[PDB]
């Protein structure tokens, strides 16, 4: 017959292979493809949808208070409101996002980010903010004069109640790794900080504790590779009624 | 100029992930209990017993895939040790709710119409392709509603989403020593069309029958706090200090 010989790698079940295998039910006629809305051909379509950041990931922020950021009328000048840990791959305010839960299925990532900060004060509430993106290397900037040297945007609470803070892709490498080292050059992303540009100025009948909802999406240049299992889920035992699937 | 081909849902979900695992005994079952596996086990084929493939397939509402069932059988010995046997296994595919066998040597294993696969341990693992067998045009991964017309039906469990039963037995008779035969099933979904993406599940799973939630006792992945806490909103955890 045909003279063959088995290579190394014969009879090994590699889980991520791509091979035609023996059909159990022959001449099976599958159900015809009815047009269902919202098909996803590519997981980056899930990533590019903006989703809420949990910037208020503190104690005494129980449940839904973690999504919003309570900014107030400040009697001082140019104060810090919040800063955002930008590690998409690691734990932090970007972990429970569409850009973050899907990227923790991967190790290496590219592309820009897209923060939208939605202001949820009254219509009479007027003020301004500055949204500084600081590329990494140094400490998290605490005064406003330090951080406006980076990539900032100055945002009014006038007709504008939202923004698009494009976090630009600034990295030496093509991609960015995940490690347990958050301070690596290959892992660290930068720092988004937010300062009172002017103040939050409300009248006597508007609530002073106005809230910011922060979104994050991806851009069209976003990319993910080197797929890995999600650390966001994991079981130590079998689930309930998993025996009942056998019994 | 970066390739986006690894985030394809055909590449995302087509990992041959562990969906079933039973170490069942292989011995004289003349004096064993009724609950224990008497050289066979049925398994209602679901994606939900193992939380890593489940959370990937629960990213979407509707999935249309072809399950490529790979059955990895491995064997151990329950005082003295002797050589491992080359046991022949049958893995008969029974549909949802049809007659599953009650014995090892019952006359349901004759497979006059059911799809079986007769494989050995020393062979490469038995890889079959179970097609898209839903009566609907996609598997309702989450099924908001009830199956029965009466009000006693199970919530979330559409039987159209259910693949079927994978009745696996050892074709050999009992041998004078007892073996522990662990059968690991690896389902690789393929030809995948995915619809309506969903929030990824953050809280840990409780049961495979539903989407109940408890959360961890503390952050991260707790009920009141999914993301792990920090000091203040203006406190950077992984801050560079030089």
């Amino acid at each position: 017959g045909v003279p063959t010989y088995l290579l190394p790698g014969s009879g090994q079940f590699l889980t991520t292979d791509d091979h035609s295998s023996a059909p159990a039910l022959p001449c099976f006629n599958p159900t015809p493809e009815m047009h269902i809305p919202g098909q996803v051909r590519n997981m980056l379509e899930v990533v590019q949808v903006e989703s809420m950041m949990e910037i208020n990931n503190t104690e005494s922020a129980v449940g839904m208070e973690r999504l919003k950021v309570d900014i107030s009328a400040l009697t001082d000048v140019d104060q810090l409101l919040f800063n955002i840990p930008l590690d998409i791959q690691l734990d932090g305010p970007l972990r429970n996002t569409l850009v973050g839960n899907i990227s923790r299925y991967y190790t290496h990532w590219s592309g820009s980010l897209e923060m939208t900060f939605m202001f949820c004060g009254s219509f009479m509430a007027a003020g301004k903010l500055i949204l500084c993106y600081t590329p990494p290397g140094g400490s998290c900037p605490t005064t406003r004069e330090t951080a406006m040297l980076g990539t900032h945007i100055v945002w009014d609470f006038g007709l504008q109640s939202s923004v698009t803070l494009i976090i630009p892709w600034i990295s030496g490498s093509h991609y960015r790794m995940f490690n347990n080292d958050a301070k690596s050059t290959n892992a660290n992303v930068g720092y988004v900080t937010c300062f009172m540009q002017t103040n939050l100025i409300v009248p006597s009948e508007s609530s002073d504790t106005c809230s910011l909802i922060g979104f994050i999406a991806a851009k069209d240049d976003f990319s993910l590779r080197l797929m890995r299992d999600s650390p966001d889920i994991g079981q130590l035992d079998h689930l309930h009624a998993a025996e009942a699937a056998y019994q | 100029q970066h390739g986006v081909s690894e985030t394809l849902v055909e590449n995302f979900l087509s990992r041959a992930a562990l969906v079933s695992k039973r170490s069942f005994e292989y011995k004289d079952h003349t004096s064993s209990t009724a609950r224990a596996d008497k050289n066979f086990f049925k398994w209602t084929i679901n994606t939900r017993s193992f939380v890593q493939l489940r959370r990937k397939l629960e990213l979407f509402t509707y999935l249309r895939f072809d399950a490529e069932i790979t059955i990895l059988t491995t064997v151990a010995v329950n005082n003295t040790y002797v050589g491992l046997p080359d046991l022949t296994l049958q893995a008969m595919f029974v549909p949802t709710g049809a007659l599953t066998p009650e014995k090892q040597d019952s006359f349901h294993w004759q497979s006059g119409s059911n799809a079986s696969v007769f494989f050995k341990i020393s062979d490469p693992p038995a890889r079959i392709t179970i097609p898209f067998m839903c009566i609907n045009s996609a598997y309702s991964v989450f099924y908001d509603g009830f199956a029965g017309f009466e009000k006693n039906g199970l919530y979330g469990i559409n039987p159209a989403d259910t693949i079927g039963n994978l009745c696996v037995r050892i074709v050999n008779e009992h041998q004078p020593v007892g073996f522990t035969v662990t059968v690991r099933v690896y389902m690789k979904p393929k030809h995948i069309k995915a619809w309506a993406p969903r929030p990824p599940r953050t809280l840990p799973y409780m049961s495979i029958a539903n989407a109940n939630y408890k959360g961890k006792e503390r952050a991260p992945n707790a009920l009141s706090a999914i993301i792990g806490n920090r000091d203040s909103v203006k406190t950077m955890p992984h801050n560079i200090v030089n």
Partner: peptide, 18 residues
């Protein structure tokens, strides 16, 4: 990979062409 020597169209490899 174009190897599909089965008579069923679903028995092919994972159609990762996009």
């Amino acid at each position: 990979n174009q190897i599909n020597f089965y008579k069923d169209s679903y028995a092919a490899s994972a159609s990762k062409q996009d």
